[PDB]
């Protein structure tokens, strides 16, 4: 009846979009950065190793001062470390021992954590009574929390395993808005430098660009062949990079609305767990299932370096806002800082 | 400098207090065994939760040993992204309804799920306790001539019950044959790629007088012992 007819319209629109993208695809980035001088080899050596987590770490997030960081592990702990002096500043137990994400507020007053409880917990760091306590338990998702980011000290954006993203209001713990359209579990999330848009990656091998205030999907990006595990905006917010289980990273442009580079090598057959950029955007760092990290020249798609100090799967990767140090976290329960 | 020295001293003291608390928490964590319960809609899984958000907790204590069992609820049927959480679990209790060979085939779906769990690259060192549930339903299904394992498992024709079987008294041989056929259908998957790092521990149960926690306790003890023996080159 109604079906098997409107799908013809959908196919026609897909054909028209693909034809327009093919027409707009004038040249390639490979034949524009042909003369760009390669970075060569890059040696970054571990400087700190942070010990204290009993089980594997899933998430880490730097602070805006590029000094403090927070890490989440399955022994039920959220640990706030001082990257300088290797000291521990805070240790917070959790009601649920199964956490998959942690976020640190830009102001430095709150942290947030999630997990298989389908609840986002907000912890207050600056209080006069006691030391730390949970101030809000955002509930309403019907799947596991996979990522969460702070927009302000009052708003938060979460992604779940129920294929929907949500924007909350921490003052009252209410779902301000819901972003729908993904057909698979939403795994990653990245905020634009101006915090006006945000990109999400899911398990249907597609990325989506959302406008925060209106709640609609501006653009859909395809090209990956498997689940997307990580996303990161470019420093200027006009492009982003994705990592997938098909053992390749990709670069997408928002204005051109298509792919620019694929970063892969025949020696890699393991999926990417995390991606991040450098301060100037020349270097793209990726963490893999084969226990290593690879540093790619983001303009020429040649592997420029390797960070190898881990014994298990590497799952966390982050770069400071100063562009000074990188932090990696692995399933062997160790946090490492490189430079 | 004086402010810097004072701040350094205060930070060191706070770190020391955190270290003491973390040491106590590690001593607690090392002595607690965590289990993952895994079943289906009607496979059982609720008579084991009985009689001792998005995840349901169960604490119990047998012979002064603590066990924490984690039942997955309010999570949809796709599992390839959250199953990887349970790679450091001491055991996965997989419950299967044995009489459901009549989706029109739930036993075959259970076999497929067990195959996926067994061959996962992140679950290479996790042992599976396998509970073949609802023996009574299978007994009254096989005693009658309503439905046959044959034409759903065509190799059931040339299957002979083993000589090592220990049937309960009052059990027909043609029921023991079906029970051990299901058990061997699971063991064919289990023993093809064990490699010595993990093992299956099949069991038969319908509703037993709290023998199930004893079976779990014994299987966990055997798992720890086999791990140590493999570590010391004795196995």
């Amino acid at each position: 009846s109604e079906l098997d007819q409107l799908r013809q319209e959908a196919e026609q629109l897909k054909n028209q979009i693909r034809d327009a993208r093919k027409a707009c695809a004038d040249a390639t980035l490979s034949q524009i950065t042909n003369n760009i001088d390669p970075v060569g080899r890059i040696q970054m050596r571990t400087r700190r190793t942070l010990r204290g987590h009993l089980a594997k770490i899933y998430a880490m997030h730097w602070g805006t001062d590029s000094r403090l960081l927070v890490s989440a592990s399955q022994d039920g702990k959220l640990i706030i470390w001082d990257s300088y002096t290797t000291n521990k500043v805070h240790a917070i137990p959790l009601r649920s021992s199964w956490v998959m994400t942690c976020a640190y507020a830009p102001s430095g007053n709150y942290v947030a954590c999630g997990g298989l409880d389908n609840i986002c917990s907000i912890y207050n760091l600056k209080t006069r009574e006691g030391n730390v306590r949970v101030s809000r338990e955002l509930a309403g998702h019907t799947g596991y929390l996979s990522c969460c980011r702070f927009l302000d000290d009052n708003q938060i954006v979460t992604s779940s395993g129920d294929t929907t993203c949500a924007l909350w209001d921490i003052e009252t713990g209410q779902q301000t808005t819901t972003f729908t359209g993904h057909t698979g579990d939403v795994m990653s999330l990245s905020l634009a430098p101006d915090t006006r848009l945000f990109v999400s990656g899911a398990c249907d091998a597609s990325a989506k660009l959302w406008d925060v205030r209106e709640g609609m999907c501006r653009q859909t990006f395809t090209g990956h062949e498997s689940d997307i595990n990580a996303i990161c905006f470019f420093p200027n917010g006009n492009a982003f990079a994705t990592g997938s289980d098909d053992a390749t990273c990709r670069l997408f442009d928002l204005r051109a609305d298509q792919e620019l580079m694929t970063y892969s090598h025949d020696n890699i057959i393991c999926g990417i767990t995390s991606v991040s950029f450098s301060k100037s955007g020349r270097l793209l760092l990726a963490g893999y299932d084969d226990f290593n990290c690879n540093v790619w020249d983001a303009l020429k798609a040649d592997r420029a370096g390797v960070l190898a100090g881990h014994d298990n799967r590497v799952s966390c990767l982050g770069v400071t806002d100063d562009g000074m140090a990188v932090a990696t976290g692995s399933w062997d329960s160790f946090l490492k800082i490189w430079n | 400098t004086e402010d810097q020295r004072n701040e350094e001293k205060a930070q060191r003291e706070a770190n020391k207090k955190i270290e003491k608390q973390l040491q106590k928490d590690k001593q607690v964590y090392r002595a607690t065994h965590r289990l993952l319960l895994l079943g289906a809609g009607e496979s059982g899984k609720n008579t084991i939760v009985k009689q001792m958000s998005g995840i349901f907790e169960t604490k119990f204590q047998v012979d002064k040993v603590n066990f924490h069992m984690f039942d997955v609820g309010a999570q949809r049927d796709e599992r390839r992204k959250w199953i990887q959480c349970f790679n450091d679990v001491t055991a996965i209790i997989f419950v299967v309804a044995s009489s459901s060979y009549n989706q029109t085939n739930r036993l075959q779906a259970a076999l497929k799920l067990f195959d996926s769990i067994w061959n996962n690259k992140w679950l290479r060192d996790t042992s599976v306790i396998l509970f073949l549930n609802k023996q009574d339903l299978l007994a009254e299904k096989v005693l009658a001539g309503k439905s046959k394992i044959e034409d759903y498992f065509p190799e059931f024709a040339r299957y002979t019950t083993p000589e090592d079987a220990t049937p309960e008294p009052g059990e027909d041989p043609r029921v023991t044959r079906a029970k051990y056929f299901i058990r061997d259908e699971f063991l064919r998957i289990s023993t093809a790629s064990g490699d010595g790092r993990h093992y299956c521990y099949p069991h038969f149960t319908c509703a037993v007088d709290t023998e199930n926690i004893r079976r779990v306790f014994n299987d966990c003890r055997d798992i720890i012992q086999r791990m140590h023996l493999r570590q010391y080159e004795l196995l």
Partner: nanobody
Amino acid sequence: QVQLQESGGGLVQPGGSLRLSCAASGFTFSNYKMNWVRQAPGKGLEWVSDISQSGASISYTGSVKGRFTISRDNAKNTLYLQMNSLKPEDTAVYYCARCPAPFTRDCFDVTSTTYAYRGQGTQVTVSS
């Protein structure tokens, strides 16, 4: 975009034969293990058959052994299913599913509803 199109199938008398085909595009077909799944009316999705990366390892359900044959061609990016002897209880929609990840020997969620890497499905009905 990962796309799969199933072709063939339809109305056939009992004892007839069909040859379902599945054309895949958007991914390297030789890196993945393929499946045929089916859904009968008023019932859930049921795994039917699968084939490995090189075609060496093949498997079926108990109810279709000796009648259904799965095949695949890597140079033509195609997956075939030959149904030789058909019965009233074979009336169903047949889907061509793909494993979520390459180079892995496990295959988790090809049977769950709302699975991304599945085809549209072709209807096979045996009536008379």
